[PDB]
């Protein structure tokens, strides 16, 4: 691929799931990719698998990890063109009264502030390259979800922050966009389902939540990311839905 040849991309949480699909999509486009993850297992194997991808251990909640991530990317590859802020977590379903302020703070640290910190540290280099930022938010930031008040709040924050930053960075030619996936079949989805009374029914429900009748694939989120980075030069501040139509349509007066 040559769509994004000569470009350098950082993907956080790139060791499995959506992040690994984004990594593969950018390598297939011709980019060199830095896989950031807090766990070694997936990302290290991915680094061996993909020429053009390398792994850097980095917990995005730790500012000194992220500092080193950016400085190592520049030291090893000489430029930085795109940051994909994919690292994030969905906790198990939790009723509002079962949440805590402290759990909510910790989820904000990962899903919101880690995106903020890498974006901030990368922006000097993105300005030099007229690069771009892609945040991985969620459909449920826009429409809500049951038993997930903290998660929904963090993704509403990411989507809004994307628009604010797009405004601030547009004078410098740096675009900032997000992708809001719906149900994507990943190890997180599989882990959440395994906690449920009937996991198999939970998965069947997840498939049928989309008009297309299936869940999405990491590769489909990856193609959207490559589009935003490489071919969407007049897109900034957009929310690209990759949801299979879940937000469409519906799903005595007393």
């Amino acid at each position: 691929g040559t769509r994004y040849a000569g470009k350098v991309v950082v993907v956080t949480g790139g060791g499995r799931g959506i992040g690994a699909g984004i990594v593969r999509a950018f390598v297939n486009s011709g980019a060199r990719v830095v896989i950031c993850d807090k766990d070694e297992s997936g990302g290290r194997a991915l680094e061996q698998e993909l020429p053009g991808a390398v792994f850097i251990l980095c917990d995005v909640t730790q500012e000194d990890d992220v500092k080193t991530l950016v400085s190592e990317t520049i030291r090893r590859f000489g430029r930085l063109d795109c940051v994909v802020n994919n690292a994030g977590h969905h906790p198990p379903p939790q009723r509002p009264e079962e949440t805590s302020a402290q759990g909510f703070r910790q989820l904000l640290e990962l899903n919101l502030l880690g995106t903020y910190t890498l974006t901030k540290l990368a922006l000097p280099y993105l300005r030099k390259s007229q690069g771009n930022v892609i945040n991985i938010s969620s459909l449920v930031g826009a429409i809500g979800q049951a038993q997930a008040v903290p998660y929904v709040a963090t993704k509403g924050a990411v989507t809004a922050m994307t628009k604010a930053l797009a405004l601030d960075e547009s004078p410098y030619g740096v675009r900032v966009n997000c992708i809001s996936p719906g149900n994507i079949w990943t190890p997180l989805w599989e882990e959440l389902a395994a906690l449920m009374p009937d996991p198999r029914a939970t998965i069947r429900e997840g498939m049928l939540a989309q008009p297309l009748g299936r869940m999405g694939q990491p590769a489909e989120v990856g193609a959207a990311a490559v589009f935003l980075a490489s071919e969407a030069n007049f897109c900034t501040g957009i929310e690209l839905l990759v949801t299979g139509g879940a937000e469409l349509g519906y799903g005595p007066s007393g």
Copy 2:
């Protein structure tokens, strides 16, 4: 007024600005109102001014303050029908690189987690009354704003959280809605403008940002809140825009 007679309302940050307008609108509707504020000056005078309103000193970032707020409301008035989460702050304009993770955390503590904490502590009583929650978010959570990445992020979070909570509380008959004001003429607006090079021009700009050619009034946000509490029984999870049309419309190819 009798639209909300016999009802008990808590308004956070009710001592001035939008919150004071909401307090007045609910008193005028027949409700008893608890004015929560971290500063005594405005709220204490408002308590003397309005029969049916009382003042409780309470910093919504301090969980034990909020606990006492709820327990004192119930001890003094016997019920709780509506919580208006209005307390919040807009920092001065800040370029992204001039923000800090720590400032962002502190703003999340006020604009997002204080709303969360009062809502959580109030929900047992709102369930008993089939009451409702009204969060004061912002238009810029939805469309973005320049030089305000942390603020925009917090309001995107509030709007999303409103939808998530509406889903969770609908089985219990508790509605959860938000109001997204645009430019409202308040002491915060006046303070921000006074920091600018030309404050008078900043204010003229703010007026003309709306098709209606003026800024909004606290009383107009108050009327929207009374509508949501007292007459919107089939509304839950909505974002009620009180913006004068700022989001409408627009404001060689190389």
Copy 3:
């Protein structure tokens, strides 16, 4: 009621259903109301029932009917403060290939162009009164609906037109807003359900389509309309959802 005392309101399709609930809500607010309908049965009885409401036979697809509607309102009441464009129809479920361009044109004539024609003829008088326009659109204009391509298209048109007109009329102090109801229990809903294989199941489905677990009432749409007319002086171009939360939330990868 005195919220809209001394004001004159026209409600199209006011003879039953949502329109009749809007008529009642405005009479209860103190307004004088002109009930426009193409059928006499409901509107005539409503005129006898409600002091302050009168009935004018008028098919909103017939420009000379609408001309006479406006001129008779002014001749009999001396002013015009608010037009509620409620007349509209939802055809039975139709697969896309079972629709016709001609059916689509006819539905546009009612749901879109009749709203346009009355608004146009009323605007000279609304300018004199600094009055306002309320269009009754639909949630499915925003999120879509199955087997309803023409209907969804007409309501997407109404919602967009509302925003365009708000922009054009804001310099004249005339606000233009819409209400997007979800499932409201009306004679139209009952008629559509009666065409289905199991009407009772269709109705049960409609109730459970909302997190609140019931359909809405005409009176709830009416209260929203009175709010927009009488108390939303800083709202223009908004889409007020009266849906019970139907748009919230959701309802292996191959």
Copy 4:
């Protein structure tokens, strides 16, 4: 290019402007393209210019033209994979009172019903190919525009219809999406500007309406269309904004 190799695409209004950019983007992707236009000049030259593109004279408001368009595409190329409904018109700025029902009907015939008619006639073949529909709507369908009530209404209709059709066609594996461009520099934009008092100032205004400080290019809309057709397999019913950020942000209380 091989992204859309072996595929057959129809682009309406493909003879100039956005449509010509879409035609070029699909040819560059490896597709064979049928250029539909009501005028011969541009499309005929484009057919001579591009191997893999051919021109068919067709007025999308004339059902027998569109019938022949589809039957000639199938007769000459054996399949149909994607329909891009780009033909449309923006009239000169018109105050609401300067519009007519008849002008509005004529604009609906082009911008809305021509899209409907080609989509309907193409869907049997798109089902066989698991193809897709791309409608070219407009940002102003979503946020409004001054002096353009009919145009805004038609584009609100197109965007809503896109979602309705996505729902209906998802069981058949046919995706239906739209693109909502903002200011794109085209012959239509140039013609509208030339009618203004100061055309040069109108163009400068149009450039600065976007945070990116320029208008968009047909090629950028084309890349978005190729993305939707060839790589967005989990996207249906979406509205892809290609606006340069015009919808972001903003642009005493009496």
